[PDB]
């Protein structure tokens, strides 16, 4: 690496660091060094903030490239095959802890994708086929929701008895929730209405509103019951912590 006397250490997204030389090199560019996964990457830049491109080659000949954004707000770490073009892996990390980590296949096509939100919640995609479809999972605090993915959107599903709950997330991040019950008895059959404006799903049974399921901006779900006659909410909303609790809300 570089000498403390000869360089400034700068922190970066994803717990990374880069050493920027104090002086410009013989070409009038600052030197850049960063060790990533035991491999030292090198680059130079006309600027001295730590932004630029660094590169290195693994023992297996794979080319590694790290791009540090101009304001140090993002890093892109790519590992290519020895041809330096076919992607093997790619991870973009933001200063806010969010990131997108993509695994590619033998032909350089993303086969898997992991999207980490700043709050730590994840959206994991695998078995990604050529037509944009694949398997999906949403990793939340306390529980995991599972579903599928298609070019249009991701759909996580939760079933309990004859009731199926589906949470849709489009590419734009738009969320919508819906519920369907195959129950025949009109006295026990669940029905629901979605209010996008408030991100809440109101369940009804036997002509009475029973519960409001709120899907928060903080990627949590809360439940609150309506009074005995089903007209107004009672008490306070309680946050879901376990998958079983969602199912209990669907019973």
């Amino acid at each position, epitope marked *: 690496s570089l000498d403390e006397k000869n360089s*400034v250490s700068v922190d970066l997204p994803g717990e990374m660091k880069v050493l920027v030389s104090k002086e410009k090199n013989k070409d009038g560019k600052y030197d850049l060094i960063a060790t990533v996964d035991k491999l030292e990457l090198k680059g130079t830049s006309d600027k*001295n903030n730590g932004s630029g491109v660094l590169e290195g080659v693994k023992a297996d000949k794979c080319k590694v490239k790290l791009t540090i954004s101009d*304001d*140090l707000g993002q890093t892109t770490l790519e590992v290519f095959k020895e041809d330096g073009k076919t992607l093997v892996s790619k991870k973009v990390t933001s200063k806010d802890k969010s990131s997108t980590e993509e695994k590619f296949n033998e032909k350089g096509e993303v086969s898997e994708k992991i999207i980490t939100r*700043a709050d730590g919640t994840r959206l994991e995609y695998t078995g990604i086929k050529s037509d944009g479809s694949g398997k999906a999972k949403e990793v939340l605090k306390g529980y995991v929701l599972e579903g599928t993915l298609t070019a249009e959107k991701t759909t996580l599903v939760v079933k309990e008895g004859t009731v199926t709950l589906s949470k849709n997330i489009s590419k734009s991040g738009e969320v919508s929730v819906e519920l369907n019950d195959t129950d025949s008895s009109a006295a026990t059959k669940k029905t629901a209405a979605w209010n996008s404006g408030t991100s809440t799903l109101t369940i009804t049974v036997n002509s009475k509103k029973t519960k409001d399921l709120v899907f928060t901006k903080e990627n949590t779900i809360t439940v609150q019951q309506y009074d005995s006659n089903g007209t107004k909410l009672e008490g306070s909303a309680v946050e879901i912590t376990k998958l079983d609790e969602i199912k209990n809300a669907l019973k």
Partner: antibody
Framework: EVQLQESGPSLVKPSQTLSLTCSVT????????WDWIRKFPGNKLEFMGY???????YYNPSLKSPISITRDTSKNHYYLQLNSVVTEDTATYYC??????????????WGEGTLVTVSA | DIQMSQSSSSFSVSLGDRVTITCKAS??????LAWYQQKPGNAPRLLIS???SLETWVPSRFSGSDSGKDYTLSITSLQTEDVATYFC?????????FGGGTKLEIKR
């Protein structure tokens, strides 16, 4: 893109406390450095302090009077407080975001600034 | 505190003429210097970072130099829109400190 706007009284008496607010829009204050800089009547600039990730702060040790910086991530507002001001605290106060998200850099985005006079 | 010194408080320049503004640090700051342009009734605007790296809004006539005894901000051809006060500032070591400002007046 971020927008910064300072708010506070134009007149505060010596011995009293000066409180200012910086209302930021277009970006959350949860990332980056959010500073307070003042411009003295003789056209002299002075860095006062900043608040950053997790509410961590730093204050210019050379300041005549001690200050404190806090934030409300819910409101996306951060504040400046200076107790027992003196006439020498008369200046135009500016809030600004540092250029880069890590390390030491300049002040890229500034508010319009508010003139605060400290006088009896 | 590192003292940043701009020995000239103000200059008067002719339209289209070359201008050079000087900035000195009390100690070595290794080009971790910023420059700002401030026009009356407006907040300072970051113009240069790293002593020579221009920001994207800046016209090509502006430049900064490292290769001298101290630091400078140069304008090859002064335009009417350049009449302003320029401030240098170091961010090498805390706390960041500013130069006193150099005001420009255009002749007519």
């Amino acid at each position: 893109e971020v927008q910064l706007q300072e708010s506070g009284p134009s007149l505060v008496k010596p011995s009293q406390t000066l409180s200012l607010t910086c209302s930021v829009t277009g970006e959350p204050i949860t990332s980056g450095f959010w500073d307070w800089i003042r411009k003295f009547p003789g056209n002299k600039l002075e860095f006062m302090g900043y608040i950053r990730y997790g509410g961590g702060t730093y204050y210019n040790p050379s300041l005549k009077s001690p200050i404190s910086i806090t934030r409300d991530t819910s409101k996306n507002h951060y504040y400046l407080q200076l107790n027992s001001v003196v006439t020498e605290d008369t200046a135009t106060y500016y809030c600004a975001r540092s250029r880069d998200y890590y390390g030491s850099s300049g002040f890229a985005f500034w508010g319009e600034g508010t003139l605060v006079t400290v006088s009896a | 505190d590192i003292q940043m010194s701009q020995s000239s408080s103000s200059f008067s320049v002719s339209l289209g003429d070359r201008v050079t503004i000087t900035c000195k640090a009390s100690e070595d700051i290794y080009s971790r210097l910023a420059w700002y342009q401030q026009k009356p009734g407006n907040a300072p605007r970051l113009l240069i970072s790293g002593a020579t790296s221009l920001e994207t809004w800046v016209p090509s006539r502006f430049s900064g130099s490292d290769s001298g005894k101290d630091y400078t901000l140069s304008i090859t051809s002064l335009q009417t829109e350049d009449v302003a006060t320029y401030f240098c500032q170091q961010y090498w070591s805390p706390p960041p400190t500013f130069g006193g400002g150099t005001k420009l007046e255009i002749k007519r």
